[PDB]
Design a protein around this nucleic acid. Sequence first.
RNA 1: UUUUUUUUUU
Length: 714
Amino acid sequence: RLIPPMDVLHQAILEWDIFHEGGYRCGNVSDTYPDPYSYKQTFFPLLINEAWRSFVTAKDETTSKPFGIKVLSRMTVDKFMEVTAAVPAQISKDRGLTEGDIVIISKGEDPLNQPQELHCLSRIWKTTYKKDTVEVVYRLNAKGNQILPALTPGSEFQVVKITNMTTIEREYAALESLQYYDLMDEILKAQPSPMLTFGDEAIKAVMDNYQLNPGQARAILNAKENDGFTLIQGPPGTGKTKTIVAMVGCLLTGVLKLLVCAPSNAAVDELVLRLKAGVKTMNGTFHKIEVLRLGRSDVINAAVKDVTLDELVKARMDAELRDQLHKEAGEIKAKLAEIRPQLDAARLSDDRASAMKLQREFDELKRRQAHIGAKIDAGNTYARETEIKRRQIQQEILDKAQVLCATLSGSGHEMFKNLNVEFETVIIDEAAQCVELSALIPLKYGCNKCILVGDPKQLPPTVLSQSAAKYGYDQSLFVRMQKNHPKDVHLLDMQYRMHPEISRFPSKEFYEGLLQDGADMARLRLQPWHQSVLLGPYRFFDVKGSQERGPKNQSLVNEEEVKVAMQLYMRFRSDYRDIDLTGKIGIITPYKAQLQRLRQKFVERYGESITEQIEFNTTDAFQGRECEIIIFSCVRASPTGGIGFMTDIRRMNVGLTRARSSLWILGDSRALVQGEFWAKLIEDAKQRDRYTNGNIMALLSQPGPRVSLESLAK
RNA sequence: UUUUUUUUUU
Ligand SMILES: Nc1ncnc2c1ncn2[C@@H]1O[C@H](COP(=O)(O)OP(=O)(O)O)[C@@H](O)[C@H]1O
């Protein structure tokens, strides 16, 4: 049984005043723990802090238009006040009211901006669709609530949906049920299985069978042999997804269940798409295995909806599947409406036979109407049987699937509480991008083998709480395990994405010179526009500009960098007209206001069609993805006060390692020198002749110089 | 040295 009581968490959350900016005892995170008690004492307050800051952010950011509810009933359940309330069905569907949402119920008309009004924090417990109404079961804290005497039956209130706490509930569930985990010892001690050394012959055999390099084959062999935690660190372009697919085939060699998880839906979708192509066992046989995606069809790729469990169950139930009775009733009533005036006229004119016939027809129509009305009154048992058939179909589909892919929170769904399933082996992708409690979620189903593919050198998980991030809540389990046992981590050491000039600096400065380029990589990234000196594989443009707060005091904008980016795109496109660039260019900037300004100006000049040829994004919203050419706007321009979160080397590495063929960086050096590694990058660009300064708008206004003929020979 | 930034939710 792995269903802990959610009373404590719900009470802690419902005992909050919404009007504060922004309990508990938040401490630092240790490397190891002796007992689940210490683990809980460390991580529960940090979870509460993260939840609190997420709630404040969602309150300030939400824009759900309020709506009126009618209080139908009030009850006391546990230590909570339960209020059933009626809501219009269309309003409910528009605002998406489901079980677990956090809402503000107020008496005033604008609840979000009326603290002095009768307000309360409530959690949705059940949503029941009747006909044109929705019965919502709100649950609030029964200790100290202003609206408690005012929620009498019939009283009307105004509600606004703030956020949802399903993810928090699942992470708390995993936290409280950790004490029964098969891998509890390894999770507490952060101890992965020891590094295995294999013979070069078996390594070469795996390489030949799966078309892998030595590091990937070593990682796969250690994932097949070792039990417990196996850590695989995959720098950019090292082949993480290919390794995972070959590893899934390798583990299923015997079977021919396996739970592949990722923190985001995008990574899950990529893994599903790659596993749909098919795996191959170590025997060398190609098998099109059964890949099953778990999640709602709204956050799921259009290409993987063919293998989504929900879609499969819906398709199966659509074959087994009162309104015709209503149609016939309408038609018989129309016949009655026809017959009645005819009968009245035949009776008002002393027409014996005609009135007799019409009365006979009238009586037959009334008989049919009574029959249809009796049948209409004839469930709910059919609905229950449909739900039972749904459950059966779910189980039957799950039992035939060999690999199940999911998000971390999605793998802790309530569904599995009524489905007999165990996941012996779990592979967590993007292992360094999720907090520890999220990683623990898929491990409650009897997992004794966990392969963590990640990269702590890139971005950490989103921790809105600056205090919890300072306490160490932004540390993934991967990071702690590698912190304690670094020699047991399998590093993928060969990248196949960046031109050697692009990868040169990150490899040395972030991967200790251990990230080597693949064979024939410079020749693979050879592009025609590299013949232009200023359009080479890698370059830093010292765009001396000025930073400025975005609209509504958002983030930062550098209009000169936007102008230079437009000028660079114009020069490149004009000097190379015959190159198909659709989907080959990306423009990334770590500040959202600069991103919006870049998109705005590019659409002003080139129209909305420009977004099909250029991927506009922020540095954080680009991880895992890549483009042929990357224009990187640094935005920061104030020579004092630092460069903000530009100082974090993980974000810098992510931003530098997105490009394949060309990376063109635009930054005001006078400000960026404040950061140590940005200074090192600018100096490196200088001492290798990849730095350009002066009037950049003028240097890009004309077609620029070409590279020497002798350099192209080599 | 003024975090302003991202995942998650049947
Ligand atoms: N041994 C290899 N030889 C040649 N190319 C490889 C090898 N391993 C990986 N690659 C290339 O690297 C790519 C890795 O894809 P992906 O897993 O998305 O990279 P990332 O590690 O950035 O997620 C593959 O598409 C493949 O073309």
